[PDB]
Design a protein around this ligand. Structure first.
Ligand SMILES: Nc1ncnc2c1ncn2[C@@H]1O[C@H](COP(=O)(O)OP(=O)(O)NP(=O)(O)O)[C@@H](O)[C@H]1O
Lengths: 407, 407
């Protein structure tokens, strides 16, 4: 029982922005996963996980979308740059890494949780182990097969004096540099028991599945690998990358550190805005394994204003907070934010679209002085208004052959 | 006994449209494999498997034909693009890798095929101890055999009570003695007391019997590695591969982490469309090692149509069930189907004739909304009629660009 296509989207809508379709498509993909494994043996393992090919500029969300999705969808993710496989050093054995990498990034995942579940027998057996101290009851147990509920009582009223009143430094009822104490034992006896419920197999075999079955790969700049003109050079080695991918894509088995895997039931997400080339130029074989094609729209002034603030920890936020530490306090007005955004955009349009990123520069650049002369004006309060903004930037933005340096 | 020529074919056109000849070829080969078993020892290990070279455009079948056959025959198979062996290929000098890989899967196969071939006990024997911890059998039993079917009074009750209701916190028996939950323990013991019957030795030695005997390879893109001349630069590099491959086809042995395998009798299937080169152009020794040459022709719309239906588990067929999963029946009209096919075809006749591959796209994009707006439809009913396809696709198929982007 997973989230409905729209249900998924909503979750994405939380920490993200536009790219709706994108969210939609990615969502769908997630959904199908369920439908897939919910039929008959024949197709059960005969339906190829539809792979998305994100077609948009500057990892403006796409990167995140994929990230977020796989996260909430709870599954092994992995960002891999296409080009990262072109040229000597690491080629064929490096293309297969993708999996390997992920697989590991998975085995680590399956661990950070395989312990969260057994996070009981740790502190419970960590306290009870050091609970067998102070004043013992008797030494007559296992004598009855139906009567055992009274003799053994060293903690039937001492378990509370080990919760808040643990302390101590006892031991029981060449290398040494650590002292054992119920105060630290209540916390250290955990590392011990937490290492008793860890079966490398129940983790290995667990991850391997939660990978070759729920894998999400994000191939960035896939468009790069495509082609150029007629006298292609490192491209005859580029296409190779593509080819070298097919296997994992088309579905296959690769040798890992914790065994072997199956890249068939895996989900991949190509990416990159195609300017020089197009999905069409892409290698048919692969171009065919990359179904769901989604067009990612640019970013609007509005969008910015949002990312400029909305985020749980906006860039404007932490900044005011940073200025705060300096005793100085700033005021990010809705009047200026618009201008802030109003700027970022202008630049992106004038120079070259990038989105989000543009901000860091435009903001930091506008907040120049303030950042510099802080204690030089500590205490008082400053207003970041639409006029204050333009007052600074205004010029720059206009001067194209320059903005390409400070922004 | 194995299927006669057409006997194979029949089971072959089960997922492939036309191109029978190739099937025949692929079929015959399969048959020969057995004929050899009849040809008395004298000519036993004195007979080549006779390998085939498939020659045809893109997305026309080849591949499938292979697998389908490989599957229909139950034998470790593996596709492989030569290309990943040329141009500064330090690994391209590892053409033997092939078997090393065909053996890897060869491993998986028999293995996984062993888990199912031995799972009737895998589960049973598991829950046993479970129930055994549930109703601890009495000590010292008086041999009567039927006296074990008696505890079933409560036992069976419990057993039946377990094949549904569980999640009880127990503890059972480098063995065990851990206190978890019957849920996990059921699958832990299901495995612990599962791998009891495997025999890694005879197992790993069972797999080789496949790769060595029942094994198939699909040397892909052979056409690439061929010729041109006038300054023999990358030429004496490509051809090389061919030679490097010979031994495998010819018949040699390769070192694998699993042992030694004899490519003597193995089905290698070279292929690719020689729009530029020609089989003749290919190195002779090989040209001669590829005795069976068959041609594949481009699929026509009619074929497409057929492809969207007749084939067992056709896209639509899948999509039908796939949609039905979200509790909603769809219906493609003989007219709509035509459209899809037509659509698909049209695109190929303006951008790139990627053949059959085209469909997957077309359709999937045709079912955009539906695939998304699913949960809500639940119980609803919709027919993908001509006027439907034509509504979504027509628009696209009309203009280029897009198609080259999302098709
Ligand atoms: N009879 C068929 N002819 C063509 N394609 C088919 C057929 N039946 C199913 N298909 C689908 O269409 C695809 C055709 O691609 P493939 O099987 O690689 O053919 P191919 O001729 O080997 N391709 P290529 O190497 O690109 O020329 C398959 O992956 C199937 O999903």
């Amino acid at each position: 029982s997973e989230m409905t296509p729209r249900e998924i989207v909503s979750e994405l809508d939380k920490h993200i922005i536009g790219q709706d379709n994108a969210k939609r498509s990615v969502a769908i993909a997630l959904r199908n996963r369920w439908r897939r494994m919910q039929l008959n043996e024949e197709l059960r393992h005969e339906v190829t996980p539809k792979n998305i090919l994100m077609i948009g500029p500057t990892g403006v969300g796409k990167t995140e979308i994929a990230r977020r999705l796989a996260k909430l969808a709870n599954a092994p993710f992995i960002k891999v740059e296409a080009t990262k496989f072109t040229e000597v050093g690491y080629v064929g054995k490096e293309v297969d890494s993708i999996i390997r990498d992920l697989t590991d990034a998975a085995v680590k995942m399956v661990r950070v949780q395989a312990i969260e579940k057994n996070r009981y027998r740790a502190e419970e057996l960590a306290e009870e182990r050091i609970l067998d101290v102070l004043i013992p009851p008797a030494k007559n147990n296992w004598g009855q097969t139906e009567q055992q509920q009274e003799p053994s009582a060293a903690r039937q009223a001492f378990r509370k004096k080990l919760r808040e009143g643990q302390l101590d430094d006892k031991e029981i009822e060449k290398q040494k540099a650590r002292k054992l104490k119920i105060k630290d034992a209540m916390k250290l006896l955990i590392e011990e028991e937490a290492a008793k419920l860890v079966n490398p197999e129940e983790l290995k075999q667990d991850a391997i599945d939660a990978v070759e079955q729920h894998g999400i790969v994000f191939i960035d700049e896939i468009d790069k690998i495509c082609k150029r003109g007629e006298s292609s050079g490192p491209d005859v080695s580029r296409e190779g990358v593509q080819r070298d991918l097919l296997p994992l894509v088309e579905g296959c088995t690769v040798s890992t550190k914790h065994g072997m895997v199956k890249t068939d039931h895996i989900l991949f997400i190509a990416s990159g805005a195609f300017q020089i080339a197009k999905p069409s130029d892409l290698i048919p074989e692969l171009q065919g394994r990359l179904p769901i094609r989604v067009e990612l729209q640019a970013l609007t002034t509005s969008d910015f204003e949002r990312i400029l603030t909305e985020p749980n920890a906006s860039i404007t936020v932490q900044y005011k907070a940073l200025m705060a530490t300096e005793g100085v306090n700033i005021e990010f007005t809705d009047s200026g934010i618009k201008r802030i955004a109003e700027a970022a955009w202008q630049v992106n349009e004038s120079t070259e679209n990038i989105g989000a990123r543009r901000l860091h520069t435009v903001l930091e650049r506008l907040m120049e002085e303030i950042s510099y002369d802080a204690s030089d004006l500590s205490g008082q309060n400053i207003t970041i208004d639409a006029d204050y903004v333009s007052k600074h930037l205004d010029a720059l933005v206009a001067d194209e052959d320059l903005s390409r340096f400070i922004l």
